[PDB]
């Protein structure tokens, strides 16, 4: 009870007559609220995963991605990708992570070779034409494509690298067609003993086993945070509540406050209104372009007004400069409550009779213990 | 007299953060010693008047 709180605050088992300060009151946030402009520049991932024709892997396509929202809600919540894995980030956490550049690398391979695309792997694709760095922090995405990329006679349009002089560095696209030397002889002309053309085309047919089937491979990649964050996940938003104390975030501006409809008119380029002491006192809603006053949530010292301990245990509480409508958010039973110019006074009986000032409260009010 | 003032030393020094408040706890009595001083000033504005 408030008397026990004064005994604890005064570190005494008995308290003399007077008024004593105690732990400050503050109206709590009723709920949290996040406001961000409704999503519009969603990334061009249709131009990746739903492009009609893919490239061959020996000369795998690169698409650069920039200035967009890297939404994966349709991506990672679809079972339609048969192997989608990430290699230095959780695929769930991508919506709360930023990038800087992005690249999509797009190509077709055999189903026995999707395992070679992973960082730190080997086999003629990974060795000769498409190697990830061993520290690859991004993701590989792949899907079974026998209904798409097979041809009834074998889809020999889709080509791979069958030979190379040396096994390659990260993302080293090679467009050379010059003849490979399998033996110690020089290779001269287009063909000869131990000469091989460095490529071959895959036999993708509707009949093939779960291995000789085609798969469409994409790698999503990024070099991180050396520069402004030109690609990032979708900043979500929640309903706009008013006339209640709440924890807001508006376009990155945090605070806890009461939000109200403002009469202030901004010019179009502004978002935060400030007061003399460089504190925020208003904000624009990103999605509705109207101005909200920000007001700090009601708070005050709590003073306990008491006759002395042995005299009596009965006490009254003053919520300094709090309107009596707001104190019941916390003695909230009331029935003897008096809004004073000094604050909401709870548990003291208002008597019209003016006596001499005994215990001060403020703004002409005093309190005393009487019949 | 002058305008009576009082501060919640924690709300100033640590506005709406428990993480800051639990660090402020490392410093002991200063957030009370400051209020004893300001309440002494405030009580004397009535006395002077």
């Amino acid at each position: 009870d408030p008397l026990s709180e004064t005994k604890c605050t005064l570190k005494s088992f008995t308290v003399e007559k007077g008024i004593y300060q105690t732990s400050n009151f503050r109206v709590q946030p009723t709920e949290s609220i996040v406001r961000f402009p409704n999503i519009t520049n969603l990334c061009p991932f249709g131009e990746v995963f739903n492009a009609t024709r893919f490239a061959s892997v020996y000369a795998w396509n690169r698409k650069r991605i920039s200035n967009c929202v890297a939404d994966y809600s349709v991506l990672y919540n679809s079972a339609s990708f048969s192997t989608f894995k990430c290699y230095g980030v959780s695929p769930t956490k991508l919506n709360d992570l930023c990038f800087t550049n992005v690249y999509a690398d797009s190509f077709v391979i055999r189903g026995d070779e999707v395992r070679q695309i992973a960082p730190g792997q080997t086999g003629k694709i990974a060795d000769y034409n498409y190697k990830l760095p061993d520290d690859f922090t991004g993701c590989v995405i792949a899907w079974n494509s026998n209904n798409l990329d097979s041809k009834v006679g074998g889809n020999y349009n889709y080509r791979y690298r069958l030979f190379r002089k040396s096994n390659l560095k990260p993302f080293e696209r090679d467009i050379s067609t010059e003849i490979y030397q399998a033996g110690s002889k020089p290779c001269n002309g287009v063909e000869g003993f131990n000469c091989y053309f460095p490529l071959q085309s895959y036999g993708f047919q509707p009949t093939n086993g779960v291995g000789y089937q085609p798969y469409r491979v994409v790698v999503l990649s990024f070099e991180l945070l050396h520069a402004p964050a030109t690609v990032c996940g979708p900043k979500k938003s929640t309903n706009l509540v008013k006339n209640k104390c709440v924890n807001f975030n508006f376009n990155g501006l945090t605070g806890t406050g009461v939000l109200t409809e403002s009469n202030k008119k901004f010019l179009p380029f502004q978002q935060f209104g400030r007061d003399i002491a460089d504190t925020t006192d208003a904000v624009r809603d990103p999605q509705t372009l109207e101005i909200l006053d920000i007001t700090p949530c009601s708070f005050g010292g709590v003073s306990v007004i008491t006759p002395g301990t042995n005299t009596s245990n009965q006490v009254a509480v003053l919520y300094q400069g709090v309107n009596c409508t707001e104190v019941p958010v916390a003695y909230s039973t009331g029935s003897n409550v008096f809004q004073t110019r000094a604050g909401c006074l709870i548990g003291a009986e208002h008597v019209n009779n003016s006596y001499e000032c005994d215990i001060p409260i403020g703004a002409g009010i005093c309190a005393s213990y009487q019949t | 007299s002058m305008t009576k003032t009082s501060v919640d030393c924690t709300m100033y020094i640590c506005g709406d953060s428990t993480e800051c408040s639990n660090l402020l706890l490392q410093y002991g009595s200063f957030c009370t010693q400051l209020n004893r001083a300001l309440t002494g000033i405030a009580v004397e504005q009535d006395k002077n008047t």
């Binding site: 400050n24 300094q320 000032c357 403020g362 703004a363 002409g364 | 009576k4 009082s6 504005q45």
Partner: peptide
């Protein structure tokens, strides 16, 4: 010619009406 951030301004015990009466 004459609340934020935990700072508070408290009223004097005697109002400007009570000072006008003593005066």
């Amino acid at each position: 010619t004459l609340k934020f951030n935990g700072l508070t301004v408290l009223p004097p015990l005697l109002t400007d009406e009570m000072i006008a009466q003593y005066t």
